[PDB]
Amino acid sequence: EDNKLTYAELCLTRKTPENITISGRKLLGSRHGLKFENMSKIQNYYITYRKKDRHQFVYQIHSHESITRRNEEHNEITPVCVVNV
C-alpha cells in the first residue's frame, strides 16, 4: 500500500550478492511512485534508502549485515520491506 509494503520479489539470471546489489541499484533509478516512508524490524537482503539534502534519496538493495556496517561507517540507511531474490 502507500504506507506499508507487503513483499518485494526480485528475479535475476544468477543469484550472487554483487549482482543483487547491482540490479537493485539499476532497477531503482528510474521513475518510481513513492519514497517508502515506513519502518519495519530487520533480521538477508532488504531495500533501503538514505536521506540527502533538498529532497534527495537513493534506492538500492543491501544485506542486513551490510546495512549495519554502513550505518556504523556513516544519514542512516533506514531499511524497508524485505526483498526475496
Curated annotation (Swiss-Prot):
It comes from the Viruses. Residues 1-85 are annotated as: Cap-binding. It is found in: Host Golgi apparatus; Host endoplasmic reticulum; Host endoplasmic reticulum-Golgi intermediate compartment; Virion. Classified as His(+) endonuclease since it has a histidine upstream of the active site that coordinates the first cation. Homomultimer. Interacts with the glycoprotein N; this interaction allows efficient polymerase packaging into virus particles. Interacts with nucleoprotein N. The N-terminus contains the endonuclease activity (endoN). The central region contains the RdRp activity. The C-terminus contains the cap-binding region. Belongs to the Bunyavirales RNA polymerase family. RNA-dependent RNA polymerase, which is responsible for the replication and transcription of the viral RNA genome using antigenomic RNA as an intermediate. During transcription, synthesizes subgenomic RNAs and assures their capping by a cap-snatching mechanism, which involves the endonuclease activity cleaving the host capped pre-mRNAs. These short capped RNAs are then used as primers for viral transcription. The 3'-end of subgenomic mRNAs molecules are not polyadenylated. During replication, the polymerase binds the 5' and 3' vRNA extremities at distinct sites. This is RNA-directed RNA polymerase L. It comes from Bunyavirus La Crosse. The gene is L.
